[PDB]
Amino acid sequence: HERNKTLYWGGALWSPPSNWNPFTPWNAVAGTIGLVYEPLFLYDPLNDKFEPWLAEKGEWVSNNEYVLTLRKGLRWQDGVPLTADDVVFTFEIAKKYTGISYSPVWNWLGRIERVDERTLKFVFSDPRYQEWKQMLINTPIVPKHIWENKTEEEVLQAANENPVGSGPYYVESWADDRCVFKKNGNWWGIRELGYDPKPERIVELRVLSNNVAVGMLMKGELDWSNFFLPGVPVLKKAYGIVTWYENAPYMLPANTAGIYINVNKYPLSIPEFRRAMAYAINPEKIVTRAYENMVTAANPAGILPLPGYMKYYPKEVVDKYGFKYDPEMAKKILDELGFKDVNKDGFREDPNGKPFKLTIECPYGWTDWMVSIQSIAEDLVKVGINVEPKYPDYSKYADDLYGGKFDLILNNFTTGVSATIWSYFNGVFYPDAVESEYSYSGNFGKYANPEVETLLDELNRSNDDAKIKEVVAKLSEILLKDLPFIPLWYNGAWFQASEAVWTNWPTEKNPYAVPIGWNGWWQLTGIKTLFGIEAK
Template sequence: MKRFFLLALFAVVLTTVIFADVVYKRDETLYAGGGLWAPPSNWNPITPWNAVTGTVGLIYETLYGYDPLKDELIPWLAESGKWTSKNSFEIKLRKGVTWHDGMPFTSKDVKFTLELAKKIPEISYSYLWNWIAKVDTPDDYTVVFTFSSPRYHEWNYQLYQLPIIPEHIWSKMSKDEILTGANEKAIGTGPYMPETYSDDRMVYLRNDNWWGNKIFGQPKPKRIVYLRVLSNNVALGMIMKGELDISNFFLPGVPTLKKTYSDIHTWFAKEPYMLSDNTAFLFINTTKKPLNDPNLRRAMAYAIDPNIICRTVFEGQVLPSNPVGFLPIKGWMKYYPENAVKQFGFKYDPKIAKDLLDKAGYKDINKDGYREAPDGSKFKVSIIVPFGWTDWMESIKLIASQLRAVGINAEAQFPDFSKYWEDLTSGNFDMAINNFNSQMSVSPWTMFNWLFNSNFDKYMYNGNFGRYNNPKLFDLITQLNSTPMEDIAANKKIVEQIAEIFLKDMPAIPLWYNGMWFQASTQVWKNWPSEKNPYAYPVTWGGRWQTGGVLMLIGITSK
C-alpha cells in the first residue's frame, strides 16, 4: 500500500504530458484514457477489436444502447422493436437520422450491414446467418428479421453490439478494404467524428448536427482527446493534476489518495469504490491429469480465499465473486440460481478442502508436504498470468500459497502476454486467470457461452480455455438462448441446471469481480455519474460507449 502511494506521489511530481501544437479550449475538451494501448491506426467497425475506442458508439452507432444499471435496452437508431411472432422481430427506425456526409439513414443500411456478412463469411458476425433466415425492408424505416431458430438472449445482445454501416459507402469497397482496411475517413451517424490523431492520442470532434441532440441532449465536450497513457501511475498523476478528466485504468493507491485529494471522483465514495464489470475466473485444464478430476477442482475452490486478494491486492476496490460468477447487476441476478448455489456452492474453507482431498485419495505419501495423486504419482500445478499485470501477478502468488497450504504443490508463473495467450488458447497450461468475455451484458448467457464454448478447435480463442466437454451442459446453454427473456421462471429453471453441473464439476473457479475502473477529476468537468447520481455507466472502453459512455458525455458539465 505504501509503495503504491509513494509511486503515485512520485508520478505527480515527474509527470509531464507533451500536448500537440494545437491548444484546445479546456472547458470544451474532455481528456480520457484507459482504452488506447497502441497508436491509433484503425477505425473499421467490421473489425471492432482492432479499432480505436470510440469507433463504435461515437462514430458508428447500434440499433439499441443498453443501460446495465436499469437493465434496459435503449432505443437508439431504432425507435422501437418487438417480436411479432416466435420467429420474427420488427424494428421501426428513427426518421431524420443522417450520416455524417448528409445522406439519409434508412432500412437499406441495416439490411446491407447484415447481408454483407452473408456475402463475406470472413466477417466476424457472419455466424448470425446460422439462425437468421432473411431480412426484409417493407419501407425505408421498417426492418423485419425472420429467424430459422430464434436465439433470444443472443439477439438482445446483438441489438446493442452490431454497428450499422452506410450502404452508399461500403457497397463500393473491395473485400480487402472491408476486412482489413483502416477506414481512416470513417463516416457514421454518431455524436462525434474523427478529427485528427497522432501516436499518443485520438481526437474526436462533436457532430453538432447529431440526430440525438433533440432526443437525448447534446454531449457537452466539443472535443474528446483520448490519450495513450502506458503507465497506471502516470495516469494517476494526470488525474490528480487535472490533465486527465476520466480514467478507465486500474489505479493503485486511489483509496488512500481519495482521503487527501477531494478532486478524485469514483463511483462509490467508499469501498469498493468501483462497480463490478466482469468476473476473473481461474480456468483449469480439464484435459490434464490429475486436473481432470472434479474432486480435485472442487477442493481447490474451497482452498482459495478471494477476500484476501480483494483487500490486499486491490485495496478494497473490488468484491469477491459469488460461486457462479454472476455479476451483481439486475440483468443477471434475476436469473440467479439460489437453489443450486445453496446445495452445491462453495466458500473459502481449507478444512473442507483438505477433507475433500483426503476422501478423493490425494494424500502426502512421501511426507514432503505435498499430496500425491490417487495413483501415487507426484504432481505440481502452475498458474499463469501475463507478466506486467501486477494485480493478477500478486493474486496468483496468493492463490499458489493457499493451494500449498492444503497440500497442493502449486507455483505462480508470469510469461509475457504473447506466450500467455498462446498457451491459454492452445490448452498448453495447467491453470490460468482470464476475464476477457465475462463482462457486463444483457444476459448471463454471454458468460456461459464463453465459459463453456462447445466449438472445440486447436486454438480456443472464444473461451472454454480448459476444454471442458459436457454435451448436456452445452445443450442447456442452447436451451437458455432459445428461451424468451421475459419468461424469467423458465430461464431460471435452466440456469439452475447449468449451475448445478458447473458447481459439481468446477471446470473454472470464479474469484473476484474486476472493477469498472473509473476515476475522474472534478477540476474541469463535474456531475460525473455515481452511486448517488446513477444516470450512466461510466465506460470509455472500446465497443462499450453504447452502454453508458455516450450518456455520460451528455450528463457531465464544465460549469
C-alpha cells in the same frame, strides 16, 4: 483546444492509434464503436432496460419474427441519409463475406424483409432470443455508400482513417499518443433524442505509466480515467477524486474473474480435485492485497450482481452446491481422493505416489493479476498442491489461453457485463471449444458436457423468465458440481474522475450512465456520460 471545452480521457488506448474499422472493433481505437459508429439499441445494465438508439422501436411480433423500426431523419457524418438500406447492408454483407465476425448470424436468421421505408422484419430459422440481444447492442450500422465497393479483404484490412459514422463525434486528428474526437454539431441525436454532447473535443490519451496517469488525475490534467490505479482509496480520502461509490468497493463490476482449468490434464480432470482447489482459495486475500478493496468477491456461481442477471439467481442451488474458503474442507477432499504426501516433501503426490506440479499463469506486467495469482498459488500450496505462478508475455499467454495449453489460467475476457446472462454461461461453457484447436469465445479448458450444450441452447431459445430461471438453476448446478471455471471476484469497471474542469459525473447517488469508455461499453450507456457532465 479551449480547456473548459475539452475532455481528456484515458484507460483504453494502449498502442498508437492506427485503426478505426467498425468490422474489427477489437483492433480499433476505443470509441470507434459509440462515438463514431452506432448500434440499434443501448442496454442499460443498471436498470435492466434497452434504449432504442438508431432504432425507434423493435419487437418480436411472433415466435420467429422481429420487427425493427428505424427513427426518421438519420444521417451519416458526410450528409448522406442513413436508412433501413444501411441496416440491411450491415447484415447482408456478412452473408457474402464469412470472415466478418457476426457472419454466423445467418445460421439462424433466415431473411430480412422490407416492410416499408424504415421498417424491417427479421425472419428467423432459429430464434435465439438471447443471442439476438447481443446483436442489437453490439452490431454497428455501417454506410453502404462507403463500404459496398470493397472486397472481403478490403473490408477486413481497412485502417478506415477519417471514419465516416453516424455518431456524435468524428476523428479530427491523431498522433502516436492520442486520438482527438470533435463534436458533430449535426448529430441526429440532438434533434431526434434531445441529447446534446457537452465536450467540443474528446482527447483520448495513451499513458505509458500508472504514475503518470495518477499524477495527471491529481493535477486535473486528466478528466476521465478508466485505468486501474492502485492507491485510489487513500487518494480519495486524502485528496478527493470521483468514483462511483463513496466507500468500498468504489467501482461498479465489469466481469467475473476466475480460473479456467484444463480438465483434460490429470489430476485436473477429477471434478472433486477442482472443488478442493475452490475450497482452498481465499478470495478476500485477493480483494485486499491485489485490489485494496476496489473489488468484491464473487458468489460461487460467478453471476454478476446486476439486476438483469440477479433476477435469475439460483439461491437454493448455490446454498446446496456452492463452495467457500475452507482449507480444512479442501484437505479432507484431497485425502478422500488419495492425494497424500508420501515422499514427505510437503506436497501431496497422486494416489499412485507420483509427484506432480501445476502452473497458474497471467500476462507479464499485469501487476494486479500477478499479485492475484501469487495469492492463489500460496493458498493451494497451503493445502499441499505444488503450484507455481508464471508470467508469460502476452502473446504466449494468449496462445496458452486460446490454444488450451495451460494447467490453471486467470482470465475474464468472456464474462463481461452484457444484455443477457446467456453470454456469461456461454463464456464459461462454450461447447465448440472442445472441437476447435483454438477457442476465442470461452471454455478455454475444453470442458465437454452434452447436458450443458442442451441447456445453453434452451436458455438462448427462451424469452420466458420462468423458463430462463429454471435453466439458469440447472446450468449453475453443473458449474458448481464440476467447476471447469472457478469464479473468484468481479474485476472492476475502473472509473475515476477529476472535477478540476468537468463536474456532474455519474455516481451511485446520480446514476444516469455507466462511465466506462472501453470498447463494448459505449453501448452499455457509456455514451450517456457525455450528456450529463458539465464544465465549471
